[PDB]
Amino acid sequence: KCVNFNFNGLTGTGVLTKSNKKFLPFQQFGRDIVDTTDAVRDPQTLEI
Amino acid sequence: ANQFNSAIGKIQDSLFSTASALGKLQDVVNHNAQALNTLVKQLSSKFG
Ligand SMILES: *[C@@H]1O[C@H](CO)[C@@H](O)[C@H](O)[C@H]1NC(C)=O
């Protein structure tokens, strides 16, 4: 669902879906070839 | 007729083997893609 998300201070708008991206434990968010945020990590559930 | 048939048969090889042209279309595609990539990458600049 398209919502305004505030992930640990990171403010944005969009729809959050389950991700096949496998973040390494130290990685907190993912970016795209043009430095656009593609993925995030949930502070509570540690979900990508 | 035999000469024309031989030449038109050799066309299917010479179009992609001898190169020369057919790089113009790919150059157009690459120029447009690179321009769009630069435009969307300029959104990561702070500009002061
Ligand atoms: C926050 O608590 C949840 C359970 O309520 C836990 O699964 C999660 O790991 C915790 N987050 C931390 C410790 O960053």
Q: CA of A32: how far to CAs of A10, A39, A44, B5, in Å?
A: 16, 9, 24, 50
DSSP state of A19: -
The resolution, in Å, is 2.7
Residues of A in contact with B41 (CB under 8 A): 34-35
Q: How many CA atoms lie within 13 A of B28 on its CB side?
A: 4
Tokens of B44: 């990561």
Min Cα distance B34 → chain A (Å) is 12
Across A1-48, the runs of DSSP E, i.e. the strands, are 2-7, 10-15, 29-31, 37-40
- How was this structure determined? It was done by cryo-EM
Min Cα distance B45 → chain A (Å) is 10
Q: Kindly tell me the burial class for residue A39, based on how many C-beta atoms sit within 10 Å of its own C-beta (0-12, 13-18, 19 or more).
A: middle
